[PDB]
Amino acid sequence: KPTDRGQQYKDGKFTQPFSLVNQPDAVGAPINAGDFAEQINHIRNSSPRLYGNQSNVYNAVQEWLRAGGDTRNMRQFGIDAWQMEGADNYGNVQFTGYYTPVIQARHTRQGEFQYPIYRMPPKRGRLPSRAEIYAGALSDKYILAYSNSLMDNFIMDVQGSGYIDFGDGSPLNFFSYAGKNGHAYRSIGKVLIDRGEVKKEDMSMQAIRHWGETHSEAEVRELLEQNPSFVFFKPQSFAPVKGASAVPLVGRASVASDRSIIPPGTTLLAEVPLLDNNGKFNGQYELRLMVALDVGGAIKGQHFDIYQGIGPEAGHRAGWYNHYGRVWVLKTA
Numbered sequence: 001k002p003t004d005r006g007q008q009y010k011d012g013k014f015t016q017p018f019s020l021v022n023q024p025d026a027v028g029a030p031i032n033a034g035d036f037a038e039q040i041n042h043i044r045n046s047s048p049r050l051y052g053n054q055s056n057v058y059n060a061v062q063e064w065l066r067a068g069g070d071t072r073n074m075r076q077f078g079i080d081a082w083q084m085e086g087a088d089n090y091g092n093v094q095f096t097g098y099y100t101p102v103i104q105a106r107h108t109r110q111g112e113f114q115y116p117i118y119r120m121p122p123k124r125g126r127l128p129s130r131a132e133i134y135a136g137a138l139s140d141k142y143i144l145a146y147s148n149s150l151m152d153n154f155i156m157d158v159q160g161s162g163y164i165d166f167g168d169g170s171p172l173n174f175f176s177y178a179g180k181n182g183h184a185y186r187s188i189g190k191v192l193i194d195r196g197e198v199k200k201e202d203m204s205m206q207a208i209r210h211w212g213e214t215h216s217e218a219e220v221r222e223l224l225e226q227n228p229s230f231v232f233f234k235p236q237s238f239a240p241v242k243g244a245s246a247v248p249l250v251g252r253a254s255v256a257s258d259r260s261i262i263p264p265g266t267t268l269l270a271e272v273p274l275l276d277n278n279g280k281f282n283g284q285y286e287l288r289l290m291v292a293l294d295v296g297g298a299i300k301g302q303h304f305d306i307y308q309g310i311g312p313e314a315g316h317r318a319g320w321y322n323h324y325g326r327v328w329v330l331k332t333a
């Protein structure tokens with residue numbers, strides 16, 4: 001009965017994936033009332049249809065929050081709480097986190113900034129492989145920025161876009177997908193699994209980042225070269241970060257979730273496990289409200305991916321392996 005990663009065993013044993021409780025086994029009020037309101041406002045504006053179908057829940061929650069928001073006082077607002085059985089049938093929901101990174105970069109080669117990011121060259125047909133581009137097969141008229149981190153560029157390839165901060169006065173610079181090199185991609189995840197460097201079930205882009213951070217530049221290039229594919233980008237006008245449902249996401253007030261289990265717009269009450277600067281469960285939870293507003297290729301079942309927000313602090317809070325909390329889905333009577 002492991003406890004290492006946020007697991008708890010105070011709510012008995014579950015038979016069905018959701019079960020009505022009289023009160024969430026959670027003491028206090030959610031700590032993010034403001035953010036939730038802000039998130040709701042974004043649903044209201046960016047997704048009128050979605051908002052119209054869930055507003056009954058959103059209003060109840062709002063009304064309850066304004067009256068003091070304590071978990072003991074939910075029934076008087078017609079709010080039901082369905083606790084989620086989670087990964088083990090002890091209520092312990094699988095939580096990973098994700099976040100918009102900001103790539104530190106500079107316009108000329110200097111200091112730690114020695115890792116180019118390219119725009120699309122007018123086609124030849126055959127563009128060079130990743131390894132060839134690293135060696136400098138490509139000209140320098142095609143560089144957009146030199147960045148701080150080779151692994152961060154890779155993560156930008158998989159995302160297909162990224163935010164770059166040149167460290168002067170100016171606004172964040174967004175770059176979107178422009179094209180590829182024509183060499184077929186191979187999955188850097190699989191490689192790290194087929195070497196035992198990372199376990200199959202803790203694999204995620206985040207885990208590839210941590211693996212990066214903990215290895216040498218040589219070890220990283222070696223690994224990255226295993227994938228001969230390469231992305232190119234172009235400058236794009238900046239846009240607030242939206243999830244699959246086209247609603248601007250609010251840090252720690254939104255999750256990505258499996259549509260067939262937690263339909264977009266579902267309201268969630270979560271005890272979310274806090275992390276060490278190590279990325280280790282630190283013994284503390286945080287009771288927050290969140291709405292399901294995004295999706296992910298490996299975000300299935302009762303697994304949630306919390307949107308931590310933008311930047312490195314959000315980055316830290318996201319972690320790089322599974323942790324566990326408790327969730328109650330909130331529905332109107």
